[PDB]
């Protein structure tokens, strides 16, 4: 399928054990896609002071449409030293590996894969 229905665990930034997906824009987008497929991806909601606590390059999920079965359609945009790779709508949050942190909520998304 071109789109996959996912429920992403929302993590508090101070709980996150692995604070990014790797060391290049290409690697982080690759790894984020694999973790999204394997159900091992968490979401941190972006606020003042969140991003400096995580590791660049960042992977964002961004709203791609204005929501089938409650799932907001999203795409991935990466960011490194203030340059983004991709173009999309509003940030729903930053993706990180999920390694068993307890979530505070779930974000239903429809991922363009």
* Residue 97 tokens, joined: 């590996």
What is the longest distance spanned by two Cα atoms in the chain?
Answer: 36
Map residue 68 onto helix, strand or coil: helix
Residues 72, 35 contacting (CB under 8 angstroms): no
**N-terminal to C-terminal alpha carbon distance within the chain:** 8
- Domains in the chain: boundaries: 3-112
Residues 41, 106 contacting (CB under 8 angstroms): no
Residues 1, 113 contacting (CB under 8 angstroms): yes
Question: 3-112 in CATH: which number?
Answer: 2.30.30
State the structure-solving technique. Answer: X-ray
Percent of the chain that is helix, strand, coil (3-state, to 5):
20, 40, 40
Nearest to 20 by CA among 101, 99, 97, 98: 97
């Amino acid at each position: 399928k071109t789109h996959v229905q996912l429920s992403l665990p929302v993590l508090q930034v101070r709980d996150v054990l692995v604070r990014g997906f790797g060391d290049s824009v290409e690697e982080v987008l690759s790894e984020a896609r694999q973790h999204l497929k394997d159900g091992t991806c968490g979401l941190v909601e972006v606020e003042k002071g969140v991003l400096p606590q995580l590791e660049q390059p960042y992977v964002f999920i961004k709203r791609s449409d204005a929501a089938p079965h409650g799932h907001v359609m999203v795409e991935l945009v990466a960011e490194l030293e203030g340059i983004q790779y991709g173009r999309s709508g509003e940030t729903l949050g930053v993706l990180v590996p999920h390694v068993g942190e307890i979530p505070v909520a779930y974000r239903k998304v429809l991922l363009r894969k």
